Amino acid sequence: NIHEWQSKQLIQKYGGRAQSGEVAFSPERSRDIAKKLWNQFPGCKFVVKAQVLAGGRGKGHWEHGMQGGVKLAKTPEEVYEIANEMIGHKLITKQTGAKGINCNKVMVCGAVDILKEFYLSILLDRAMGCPVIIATSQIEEVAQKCPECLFKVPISVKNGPTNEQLVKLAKDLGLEGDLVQDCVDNVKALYQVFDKCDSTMVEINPLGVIETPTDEKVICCLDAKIAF
Amino acid sequence: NIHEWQSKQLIQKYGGRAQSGEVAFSPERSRDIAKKLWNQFPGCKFVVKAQVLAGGRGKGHWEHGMQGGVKLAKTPEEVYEIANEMIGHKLITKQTGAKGINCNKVMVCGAVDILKEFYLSILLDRAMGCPVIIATSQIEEVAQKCPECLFKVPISVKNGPTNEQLVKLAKDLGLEGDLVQDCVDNVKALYQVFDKCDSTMVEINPLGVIETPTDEKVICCLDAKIAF
Numbered sequence: 001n002i003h004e005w006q007s008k009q010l011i012q013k014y015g016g017r018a019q020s021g022e023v024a025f026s027p028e029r030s031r032d033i034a035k036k037l038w039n040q041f042p043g044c045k046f047v048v049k050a051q052v053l054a055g056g057r058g059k060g061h062w063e064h065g066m067q068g069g070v071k072l073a074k075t076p077e078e079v080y081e082i083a084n085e086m087i088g089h090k091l092i093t094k095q096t097g098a099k100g101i102n103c104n105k106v107m108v109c110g111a112v113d114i115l116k117e118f119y120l121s122i123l124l125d126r127a128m129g130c131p132v133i134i135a136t137s138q139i140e141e142v143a144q145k146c147p148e149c150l151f152k153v154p155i156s157v158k159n160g161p162t163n164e165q166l167v168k169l170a171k172d173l174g175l176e177g178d179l180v181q182d183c184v185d186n187v188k189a190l191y192q193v194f195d196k197c198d199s200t201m202v203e204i205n206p207l208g209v210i211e212t213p214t215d216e217k218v219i220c221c222l223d224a225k226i227a228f
Numbered sequence: 229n230i231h232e233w234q235s236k237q238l239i240q241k242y243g244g245r246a247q248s249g250e251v252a253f254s255p256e257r258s259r260d261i262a263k264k265l266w267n268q269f270p271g272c273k274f275v276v277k278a279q280v281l282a283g284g285r286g287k288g289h290w291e292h293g294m295q296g297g298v299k300l301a302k303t304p305e306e307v308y309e310i311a312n313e314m315i316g317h318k319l320i321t322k323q324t325g326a327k328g329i330n331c332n333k334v335m336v337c338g339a340v341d342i343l344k345e346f347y348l349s350i351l352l353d354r355a356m357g358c359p360v361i362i363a364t365s366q367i368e369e370v371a372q373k374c375p376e377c378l379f380k381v382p383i384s385v386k387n388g389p390t391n392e393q394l395v396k397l398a399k400d401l402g403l404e405g406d407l408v409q410d411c412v413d414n415v416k417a418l419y420q421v422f423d424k425c426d427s428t429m430v431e432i433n434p435l436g437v438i439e440t441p442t443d444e445k446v447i448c449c450l451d452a453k454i455a456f
């Protein structure tokens with residue numbers, strides 16, 4: 001499986017929208033990324049995301065407390081502080097145990113208004129022998145407590161997804177207006193990645209509805225993981 | 229006199245907020261700047277500003293038809309198109325005449341919500357023999373048609389501006405809440421530039437109230453000109 005930054009760039013290579021930010025291997029560099037971003041959107045806030053091969057970062061904790069592998073920062077100096085407590089230190093989440101996985105890089109992103117967060121993945125379903133799109137706006141828990149809340153769209157491996165399936169899926173997720181077609185185009189892009197890269201899973205957790213700096217609502221992958 | 233980019237970077241060096249963007253000397257580079265900015269704020273729009281030693285770009289026009297030296301762009305490709313018609317071409321404004329001034333670089337900026345636009349300049353007043361801060365929220369026309377709309381704050385070159393003078397100026401311009409102190413700190417930065425650079429004029433036209441990507445209101449220099 002390829003890292004977050006690399007999957008997102010692959011998704012955007014194929015016409016999808018994703019917040020890949022920029023990766024840093026030192027707190028000095030993390031700060032410089034933030035300072036330069038203030039040239040473009042002055043006053044913006046920042047998000048620092050520990051780049052570790054492990055899930056559930058948002059609710060881990062570090063040696064010196066901290067808590068959470070995804071944290072908001074108001075200034076480049078706050079980016080330095082947070083980054084300095086991530087790089088070269090050990091995060092502890094559910095997927096790691098008391099061991100804790102080491103972190104030697106972070107992702108620095110501009111902070112955006114997140115209006116909605118969905119789960120969406122494109123899986124190779126061996127049983128049926130076809131790709132299947134799995135999405136929900138609420139992943140193993142939701143399927144058991146509310147299986148109806150989960151949508152599974154089998155895909156024709158010769159024709160690919162139909163606009164009918166994708167439009168329905170988008171509306172089933174609660175999207176309206178321009179976000180419906182926006183979601184179709186992004187899901188089409190995710191499928192090309194799935195297909196053209198011979199992936200067994202393209203998982204977007206979360207696929208979000210965010211606001212641009214000028215308040216437009218757009219679909220954007222806020223996380224990405226591609227397996228082969 | 230130093231260019232927009234250099235003044236803005238100088239202003240931020242001293243604690244002010246300015247949208248310096250990033251300068252490009254080709255439309256290919258302009259496009260790349262926009263593409264990379266979409267990694268940070270996906271879906272954002274862009275502004276392309278012709279970098280020419282001449283004023284009134286917003287209302288100028290180019291020899292081959294295109295209108296305006298400051299133009300909005302929806303995508304990196306729209307940035308390329310606009311930049312390609314600016315770099316290596318001739319702009320015509322009021323300050324240039326039928327000759328038209330050549331442009332060999334543009335500034336690519338993220339588009340932001342602009343809520344208010346002020347004029348603010350720090351001048352070496354020969355008559356009074358001291359620096360004077362000149363600001364208005366409505367420059368030669370306004371001074372004649374509404375002299376009351378213009379505020380002039382003489383500065384003691386030994387004490388610098390007082391927080392009292394700057395706070396009053398901020399409220400005189402109609403600012404309230406956190407924007408008052410925000411404006412004070414930015415004006416303090418503009419004065420240090422004026423002083424430490426032995427300038428005869430630091431002109432910010434417009435000094436704006438803009439929204440951050442997460443809807444915070446902040447003071448930001450959207451243009452800058454420093455004379456010697």
Ligand SMILES: Nc1ncnc2c1ncn2[C@@H]1O[C@H](COP(=O)(O)OP(=O)(O)O)[C@@H](O)[C@H]1O
Nearest residue numbers: 047055056057058070109110111112205206223
């Ligand atoms: N640009 C951003 N602005 C604000 N919040 C963000 C941004 N990017 C990510 N987040 C938040 O970070 C959370 C955790 O992100 P994610 O990469 O999914 O980590 P995890 O493995 O903990 O789920 C997301 O649910 C989202 O709310």
Ligand SMILES: Nc1ncnc2c1ncn2[C@@H]1O[C@H](COP(=O)(O)OP(=O)(O)O)[C@@H](O)[C@H]1O
Nearest residue numbers: 275283284285286298337338339340433434451
């Ligand atoms: N980042 C931006 N987003 C939106 N509009 C902008 C941005 N930067 C500048 N503008 C607009 O461009 C106009 C012209 O900009 P400026 O640099 O002052 O050129 P000039 O004053 O020579 O016409 C401003 O009055 C403002 O309305």
Ligand SMILES: [Cl-]
Nearest residue numbers: 252253254257
């Ligand atoms: Cl170049």
Ligand SMILES: [Mg+2]
Nearest residue numbers: 056205206223
């Ligand atoms: Mg995730």
Ligand SMILES: [Mg+2]
Nearest residue numbers: 284433434451
């Ligand atoms: Mg101007």
